[PDB]
Design a binder for this molecule. Structure first.
Ligand SMILES: Cc1cc2nc3c(=O)[nH]c(=O)nc-3n(C[C@H](O)[C@H](O)[C@H](O)COP(=O)(O)O)c2cc1C
Ligand SMILES: Cc1cc2nc3c(=O)[nH]c(=O)nc-3n(C[C@H](O)[C@H](O)[C@H](O)COP(=O)(O)O)c2cc1C
Ligand SMILES: Cc1cc2nc3c(=O)[nH]c(=O)nc-3n(C[C@H](O)[C@H](O)[C@H](O)COP(=O)(O)O)c2cc1C
Ligand SMILES: Cc1cc2nc3c(=O)[nH]c(=O)nc-3n(C[C@H](O)[C@H](O)[C@H](O)COP(=O)(O)O)c2cc1C
Ligand SMILES: [Ca+2]
Ligand SMILES: [Ca+2]
Ligand SMILES: [Ca+2]
Ligand SMILES: [Ca+2]
Ligand SMILES: [Ca+2]
Lengths: 211, 211, 212, 213
């Protein structure tokens, strides 16, 4: 099965499904993984603070270290080209200067406006509770995740989003500071070896209401 | 006035930006809003439990009732064709029998599989802490939200995801049970009246690494 | 979509206000909502706006346990209720006259001049009332508020049972209030119903009203 | 005249607009059908052992207004201009209606005769042996509960009221022809169509009137 790119928006959305068995002999070139991640990170985020951080778990070394933490999802882990583990940086505002300074350098805003924005943004973010900030980073990182899955599909790959992993211990196992980086979601990615099962969705009346 | 659609996936992704001023006289036909939402809700969710609930705020009356709660986001609120307020249902498992029943009716699984899945899913979901369930529904609802913003853009509309609203009171203001439904984020949607500002993203090396 | 339980039709609220005696023991009314109900209840009228009512909201296991014997045969309501509201009347209610009428000046409803003219007759009137006469005043005022409380509770989706059968001689002391100053008027059990109220009969109105 | 007025059906609107109006339209009179609807709803109020001790003198005639005029003292404008001055009395021998009330419950299939007898077996000795002061407390409370509901219902019908305690309670029963030993005045309520807006009034912060225990 040739890798087959998909250019049509509706066809990408329609083909995005949870594949759970990938081709073990297919590895995604780094340059292509970086293109996919670059596209995903164009996602929006609260005050453009981009709190998402991705561990691209490709080696047998690291996969083996995290295998038990993935429990009944071991076969996605085993067969995938990579297991992407998406964390949220609870001190994401540490990059405010870099990010907003980049906007100034790229002539998207003046320094004057950068200072006026950051004068309210920084105290707001710094004063958030841990729980409030966890909510923020979970939401932003998930927005990026969805765009990642769609882009992966456009490139001809398939994914499986995964929450059934040990979120209490995963940062420690991989070596990230568990006080600062909270795991949000994992995404298995690769070339499909088995078709996804189709799934149902609720009737629209069960999920939206006009007011 | 039929809007110009965007059929190419990459162009849709590249064109998704936060628009904050909409055409006040342009209202999205209900059939089209429902097509957008139907496409959005093909997003994945944990155990396919689809905890998202969208309040499509479009009337003068409800817009006026929620105006104070939107604070400095009044322009998006007033000019939008709709302000979508996305809640997560903390008791989303009450629809498990319905959803999984639908999967058997549509020949996607046999009843033995359905029963075995529910035998572990229900206890797990029913015994999660409020905070744990809040994490699940924030993540799922955000996945859906991203697909909604992209679909809206494919349709020629624009959006602005919004977090700066009174989440403590919003459920009560609109009449939803705040014990069951937590607000996740809002999305202003309509026909653009002012171009979005372009914005920067972090270099790839500051957001991902290979392990 | 699961909504807040509200009854907004005025007649519907009055019609469904019935004495519920068995409540859902697991359901507790959030404080914000109790305060909203009490805020609306206290919009009731009172003689010279002196607002003599004082509400002990008995919700804790410890205080429930303490008042339990005082509630005698109303044990179903005390036990199962989200709260037992015990309404007292302040026989020295006029001690808040400067505060109350002061707030009216602050809120631009009357001038200080008018506040002084009013209090110049109201204070000697209230201060020279007998104990029994003041008890009549606070019983009436507190009952007016209590009815509006029960109606507002029903409008919020809750039910009530007004209760007079408790130990009024000792309840103030049990709760920690000065029995000389604060007289018990009535108690109101409040919560989410676990059993429908029994319906009750009313007299034909021509046995209780006449045109003169 | 006697036009039926604009109703307020929203519970919060009714509660928010219930204020003491002291000047009514002197030429507006409330039709009996409407006053009776108002009283019918009001008497759905609860009362101790459902004994319903309230008795309403609906003073509407020029003749009876004149008779009670001096008894209303500085409340003369409310009396004069009102469609009616309601004077609510409490019956200190309210248990004389027990057989009727409880009998009606049996007739209406809300309880068995068997249960009615058991209830009255304790209720009657209890009520008949209360002190005069204890009974006055009961009837004041019950009648006040009904009075609040009457004022709200009146407002829902588009009318306004003014509760009034400043009248001659010592003599009012005798003046209108009620047995002053048996019937005690609780409060009066002026009712009519407003001719001037009520003054807005303040309430204490709730922290001064309630606490959680
Ligand atoms: C969760 C979330 C909350 C946001 N809150 C607001 C908001 O309250 N008001 C607003 O104008 N924009 C809000 N934004 C828009 C962001 O500022 C915007 O996405 C970011 O600056 C990137 O710009 P772009 O969306 O044009 O790519 C929010 C975005 C997200 C994802
Ligand atoms: C946040 C999240 C967590 C998930 N967790 C797992 C998981 O641990 N293991 C797994 O096999 N699938 C997992 N799923 C996949 C869902 O079961 C799947 O998305 C859902 O059944 C819908 O099917 P679809 O993705 O093919 O549309 C997860 C999905 C999401 C969004
Ligand atoms: C002042 C007062 C005291 C009451 N005392 C009790 C009581 O001690 N125990 C009880 O079960 N009900 C008590 N009741 C409830 C009455 O029995 C009830 O209101 C009456 O039977 C009418 O029924 P309803 O409230 O359902 O309309 C009391 C009611 C009032 C107004
Ligand atoms: C029991 C009672 C007796 C009252 N007595 C009089 C009275 O004699 N004359 C009068 O003008 N108002 C009287 N008032 C009206 C009060 O002054 C009024 O309710 C209070 O100032 C609150 O204003 P509001 O009713 O507009 O909310 C009485 C009220 C009550 C409840
Ligand atoms: Ca830079
Ligand atoms: Ca500059
Ligand atoms: Ca650390
Ligand atoms: Ca009969
Ligand atoms: Ca029998």
């Amino acid at each position: 099965q040739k890798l087959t790119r998909i250019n049509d928006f509706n066809e990408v959305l329609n083909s995005r499904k949870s594949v759970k068995v990938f081709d073990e002999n297919y590895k995604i070139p780094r340059e292509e993984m970086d293109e996919i991640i670059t596209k995903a990170t164009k996602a929006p985020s609260s005050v453009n603070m981009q709190p998402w951080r991705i561990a691209v778990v490709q080696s047998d070394e690291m996969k083996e270290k995290v295998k038990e933490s993935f429990g009944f999802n071991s076969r996605q882990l085993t067969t995938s080209s990579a297991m992407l583990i998406i964390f949220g940086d609870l001190q994401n505002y540490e990059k405010a200067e870099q990010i907003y300074g980049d906007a100034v350098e790229q002539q998207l805003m003046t320094e004057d406006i950068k200072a006026q924005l950051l004068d309210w943004i920084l105290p707001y973010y710094k004063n958030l509770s841990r729980e409030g900030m966890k909510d923020i980073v979970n939401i932003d990182s998930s927005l990026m995740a969805m765009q990642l899955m769609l882009t992966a599909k456009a490139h001809g790959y398939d994914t499986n989003p995964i929450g059934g992993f040990d979120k209490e211990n995963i940062a420690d196992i991989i070596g990230y500071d568990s006080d600062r980086y909270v795991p949000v979601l994992a995404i298995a990615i690769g070339k499909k070896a088995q078709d996804a099962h189709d799934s149902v969705r609720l009737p629209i009346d069960d999920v939206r209401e006009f007011l």
